[PDB]
Amino acid sequence: MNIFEMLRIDERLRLKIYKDTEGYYTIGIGHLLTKSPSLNAAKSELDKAIGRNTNGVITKDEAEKLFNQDVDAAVRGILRNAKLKPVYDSLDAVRRAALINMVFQMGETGVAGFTNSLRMLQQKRWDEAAVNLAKSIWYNQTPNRAKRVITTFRTGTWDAYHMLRKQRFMQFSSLEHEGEYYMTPRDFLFSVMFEQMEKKLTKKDIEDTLSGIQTAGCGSTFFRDLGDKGLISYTEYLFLLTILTKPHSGFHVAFKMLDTDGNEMIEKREFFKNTTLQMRFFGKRGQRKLHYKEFRRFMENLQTEIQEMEFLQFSKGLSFMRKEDFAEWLLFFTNTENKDIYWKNVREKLSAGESISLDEFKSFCHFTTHLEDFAIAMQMFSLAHRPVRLAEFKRAVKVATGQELSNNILDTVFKIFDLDGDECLSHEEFLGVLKNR
């Protein structure tokens, strides 16, 4: 939630020296090195700011030293600018980040030529400011970044930046090919299950990516079979996360949106801009075409794969989950694992009962993918403020989602989330907990 993370979304880490848009040798996280086509000077001005003319490649540790020195100089630049500083001080903490973002990118003085927009910002004429900035050469040169910044000025929010999900991806990615990070399928699976504790691309890694697909099973063990033999871009990671919680209907929207030419088939060209998915969906040399039935099945199998993996994680390798094991999963799924009241319900309110099978657990997970259908079906209960009894809940799940929850799954749900002891779940006790994570 801060300028530093904003700018690592906006300015991408590059450990080799590189020409920018403007053509200047640059390095790290948008560090400007020299304004001289002399590359020899690019390693000189580099040196006394580093400890060595270069090393060819810088490494990340020092790249962050640079990035910190720039960000503060940027702030210092603004604070000692007559035109910028008043504006800067009228601004809330987030808008200041937006304006620091601007100076970091263009310099204190460039951002000082934006006379009118600066006026409007001080007046908190957010809308006129956003409109005027969007006509600038700066917008035209880097419109995706300028839009994110402008939206920050308009809304005083971080909605334009998804700082958390870019942080997850880098924390689990294990491969790199010229500044671009990559997950393996093992990395991807760990990232949806664990909070934490889970190199550069080579010709082996790429060759493994095809042969892995040749050896991996084609169903719900695809990613576990692949393991580290594969590659997933940041964009494909976000794509899978966006769709993996959806019912089938959401798969079909995603497919129709890829299918730009309308022939009910995805071509590698229609897919995002070789990864594991590209090879799976479009074959090795990129001329297989993906039909919806195959896409749907793939997404279904990945959902199942994730369910089976999480089941064995919380069962600790046993064939059945204890009710207490399912309860622990429920806390993490509902994002309530740090609320003491729920842990107390687990330890003290849960009968020893039958253990919970994989199939029962999968039915519960299937139900969770149809939550909005279930919420809509439950609206008379919710609007009436009428807490729901176990039997009525069971029936509603079956009617609204097709799923059969066992009394033992449902007993566990009710014992965990019934907070006032009436043996019923009010709207805030369960629906409110979900998606108001």
- Would you tell me which residues interact with Ca ion (CB under 5 A)? 259, 261, 263, 265, 418, 420, 422, 424
Choice among 11, 70, 225, 360 that is catalytic:
11
365 is in an annotated binding site: no
Catalytic annotation present for 89: no
Q: Are 189 and 277 in contact (CB under 8 A)?
A: no
Residue 420 binds to its own copies (criterion: CB under 8 A): yes
Per-residue binding letters, 196-235, with its own copies (x by CB under 8 A): ---------------------------------------x
Task: Tell which residue, 241, 271, 230, 243, has the closest CA to residue 169.
Answer: 241
Establish if 239 lies at the interface with its own copies (CB under 8 A). Answer: yes
Of positions 75, 254, 358, 434, contacts its own copies by CB under 8 A: 254
Whose Cβ is closer to its own copies: residue 43's or residue 145's? 145
Closer to Ca ion by Cβ: residue 228 or 428: 428
- Please state the closest distance from residue 16 (CB atom) to its own copies, in A: 22
The sign of the dihedral angle between the CA atoms of 157, 160, 165, 166 is: negative
Count the Cβ atoms, other than its own, within 10 Å of residue 262: 7
Q: Does 377 bind its own copies (CB under 8 A)?
A: yes
With CB under 8 A as the contact rule, the residue among 89, 127, 178, 359 that binds its own copies is: 127
DSSP-derived secondary structure for 51-71: SSS--SS--HHHHHHHHHHHH
Nearest residue to 361 (alpha-carbon basis) of 334, 385, 327? 327
DSSP state letters, 260-297 = TTSSS-B-TTTS----HHHHHHHTTTT---B-HHHHHH
First-to-last alpha carbon distance for the chain, in angstroms, is 18
Least distance in Å: CB of 265 to Ca ion? 5
Among 68, 90, 141, 242, binds its own copies (CB under 8 A): 242
Closer CB to Ca ion, 259 or 337, in the complex: 259
Dihedral angle of Cα 164, 166, 168, 170, to the nearest 10 degrees: -150
Question: What's the token pair of residue 211?
Answer: 């042969």
Q: What does the angle CA 120 – CA 121 – CA 123 come to, to the nearest 5 degrees?
A: 65
Give the residue, chosen from 18, 62, 171, 250, that forms a contact with its own copies under the rule CB under 8 A. 250
Our CB check for its own copies shows the closer of 325 and 429 to be 429
Identify whether the C-beta of residue 65 lies closer than 8 Å to the C-beta of residue 46.
no
Which of 162, 284, 291, 435 touches its own copies (CB under 8 A)? 162
Strands (E), 60-179: 175-177
Active site residues: 11, 20
The binding site for substrate consists of 32, 104, 117, 132
Q: In the complex, which residues of this chain contact its own copies (CB under 8 A)?
A: 126-127, 130-131, 133-135, 139, 143-144, 147, 150-151, 154-160, 162-163, 165, 235, 238-239, 241-242, 246-247, 249-250, 253-254, 256-258, 272-273, 341, 344, 372-373, 376-377, 379-385, 387, 395-396, 399-400, 419-422, 424, 426-429, 432
